[PDB]
Design a protein around this ligand. Structure first.
Ligand code: 11Z
Ligand code: 11Z
Ligand code: NAG
Lengths: 171, 171, 171, 171
């Protein structure tokens, strides 16, 4: 009983993100977590992965005109978590039905035929424990694959396969 | 007030579509068309394609719980157009901002590494010409690639390459 | 399906309802829920609200010739849910397009210049979760105001504004 | 501001309750449910029952010096459940043996030669099921009359014979 209790997360500024313009808030404790993949290339060093989070955000902000990067968090192959819209802000990653009730975490890369390395999976699962510890997620939150709530291949066959084994997975 | 029979279109009953539960209407004339791909398996024959349209609909209806397959029309490699939600019903293809202002056509298959055959491309273009003559689409309608309004690989690199050349395409 | 029954509902017999002659069943699970107001007298007490339920049913059966109170459920300002045709029977409350696909719940009163109390709103929302849990409603169900599916003032400006904030509301 | 759920409970603030000062927590899943009657005045309308929960709490807080009304939940003859200490706070209703291992619910009134109306009994069981849904109550939960765990006439002969006919009642 040490209050914070969880997660090292690379913050927005540390990855030089553009300021967010999003104001819509999620209502904690959140019950659903939606796992996607960027379906782009991977990265496996702090500097590349930080560079890739900037790209993704650029796509969503510069091209799509969104208020900030879609995801609440992004997972690098560097084994670090990148802060997106975070725990309190409604993300734009699952559709109008799941966005206001979920936390979207996206693995940077394409896992159709490839798996995230062990450290990326640990960072993702540690992030979720962190979420529960903070009361950001319900203790009995449910994890969905992106393809379970939207017509997409996301998070990729290999990763989809993995999250299906998870404690909190519920299709 | 003279209308043409531009419909080469395979009716829902003909591809044996489950009945639609969708009620929200599109107001005509519609200004935008959003092109996507199913990122699925392709089909080249009226028989294999009717089957594919069934599966794509099954996925959206049975797995995702939607009122009907999300696209307004699907395009087969058999060179035929499969009726989805049609010209009058709002689709569920490109998010809450674009769904209500556009018609969503999806080519059945994954075009990341393949272009659709000429006849598939002819069908799509003919469908659009059809739409204009029917008054369903504004004559100066704009084409967008899925990845232009939502974060996706869709419609696939090759197919995206192609649509960027189209007369009605717009940044 | 699932043993655990749901919610507190004032049964037909308790509010002394005339027996139903209504036979057309709804197809479970139902996708839509239409919210109306009776535009009639309000009541704040079990005694007065049972009475009002009786009068609404009476007027529908005796003056309109319907087989049963047209609503599937009624909501009182006493904060209780009154059993109408229930979950399995088709109501007569939204027109012929909608009556066969939806559940109709009506707040007893006229909401144009009044909002119904929190307990009424609570009863209504709780009833819907119960329907979902029972399998009578789709987990994804969509809530609509009576005025969205028919030309009407129902459910009344004030109540219509409130249901627009419901997490399952789709215009 | 905490408004989800559930068994349709009138929240603390809605009945104008003094803020609680209790800090002791209950270890969920809880095992026992004790049923008592207030032995006070009964009420049949939301207005009168809110006033009655207030009176009970005031007596407990001003006169006995307790941190909060001692019951976790109060049941009014209006068919509504009134929030007391709730699911997460240890109450003061059945003694030091029973207060830390049980949830105490109290029917407002004197049921010696009187019976609570069906709607009051409905709210009660509905309350109990919603407790399970949350993990606050263990599905195996046993129901005890106040008089089964303490020397007291509570909850009254009449109400006591009834709770014995309940499915989870253990003598
Ligand atoms: O979570 C939200 O949508 C609000 C954040 C604002 C940025 C997004 C703009 C909305 C434009 C439609 C884009 C689709 C993409 C998939 C998720 C549902 C929205
Ligand atoms: O929202 C309202 O005002 C109406 C009440 C909804 C009915 C209750 C649903 C039964 C299952 C409880 C689910 C709850 C547990 C509390 C936290 C969020 C979800
Ligand atoms: C799961 C979900 O709600 N997604 C789609 C959404 O993209 C669209 O805004 C809406 C319009 O019909 O249809 C929904 O089914």
């Amino acid at each position: 009983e040490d209050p914070p209790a969880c997660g090292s997360i690379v913050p927005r500024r540390e990855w030089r993100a553009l300021a967010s313009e999003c104001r819509e808030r999620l209502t904690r404790p959140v019950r659903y977590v939606v796992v996607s993949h960027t379906a782009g290339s991977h990265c496996d060093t702090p500097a590349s992965c930080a560079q890739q989070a900037q790209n993704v955000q650029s796509y969503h902000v510069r091209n799509l005109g969104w208020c900030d990067v879609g995801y609440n968090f992004l997972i690098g192959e560097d084994g670090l978590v990148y802060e997106g819209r975070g725990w309190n802000i409604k993300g734009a990653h699952a559709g109008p039905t799941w966005n206001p009730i979920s936390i979207g975490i996206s693995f940077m890369g394409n896992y159709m035929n490839r798996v995230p390395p062990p450290r990326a999976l640990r960072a993702a699962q540690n992030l979720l424990a962190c979420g529960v510890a903070l009361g950001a997620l319900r203790s009995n939150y449910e994890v969905k694959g992106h393809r379970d709530v939207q017509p997409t291949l996301s998070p990729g066959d290999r990763l989809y396969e993995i999250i299906q084994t998870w404690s909190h997975y519920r299709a």
